[PDB]
Design a protein around this ligand. Structure first.
Ligand SMILES: COCCNC(=O)N1CCN(C(=O)c2cccs2)C[C@H]1C
Length: 119
């Protein structure tokens, strides 16, 4: 019932993600010179460094907010990829499954802790 536990859990999960080779394309903001049409397609850029920074700044209130930004990384990748058979797309899908598998208990524990708090 620890309401704050999510934060270290998410720090640990981001560490795992940074160790995953599949995260390499998603670790830094897209270079807008290198992909000059990016912002024509993507309204809200997001990357794992930004997520980690936001977390470490104390600018997430909940794991749900972190989970929304991480999912945006994957939706951005999926939207910019020209093919479902692309390398980056395939990496997105794998990393997303890994993330979703690990974030599920973080979310459940948090929501459970909050419910207990308001019981
Ligand atoms: C020669 O192969 C290069 C392959 N790389 C790419 O196509 N990209 C990098 C990933 N991406 C994204 O949307 C995001 C990067 C950060 C977070 S989401 C798509 C695109 C810019």
């Amino acid at each position: 019932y620890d309401i704050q536990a999510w934060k270290k859990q998410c720090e640990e999960l981001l560490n795992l993600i940074f160790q995953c080779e599949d995260s390499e394309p998603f670790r830094q903001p897209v270079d807008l010179l290198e992909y000059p049409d990016y912002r024509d397609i993507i309204d809200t850029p997001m990357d794992f460094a930004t997520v980690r920074e936001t977390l470490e700044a104390g600018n997430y209130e909940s794991p749900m907010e972190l989970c929304k930004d991480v999912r945006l990384i994957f939706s951005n990748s999926k939207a910019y990829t020209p093919s479902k058979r692309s390398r980056i797309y395939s990496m997105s899908l794998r990393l997303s499954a890994f993330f979703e598998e690990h974030i599920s208990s973080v979310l459940s524990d948090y929501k459970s802790a909050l419910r207990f708090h308001k019981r």
